[PDB]
Amino acid sequence: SKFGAISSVLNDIFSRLDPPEAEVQIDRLITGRLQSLQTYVTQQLIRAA
């Protein structure tokens, strides 16, 4: 999933756009990949109860 960015591949973005314009799509992917993992840990702690 891209979460509204250009592509879901990281090496496309790091070798496609600018050294300081790719850091708003990478920061968009990171704030969804750290949210999906947080939701997974939260649901695992719910199931562990």
Partner: protein, 48 residues
């Protein structure tokens, strides 16, 4: 770029680029190419 006759807005010419090798370092020292104000790609990332 060194072509004499160009086109207008209502009759904008088409020109596709086929199987080739892109050398964009030569394209900057020529007299036409000055500006690259755009998004989607980068001028330094066209060589990769």
């Amino acid at each position: 770029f060194n072509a004499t006759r160009f086109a207008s807005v209502y009759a904008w010419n088409r020109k596709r680029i086929s199987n080739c090798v892109a050398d964009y370092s030569v394209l900057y020292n020529l007299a036409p190419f000055f500006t690259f104000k755009c998004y989607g790609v980068s001028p330094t990332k066209l060589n990769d």
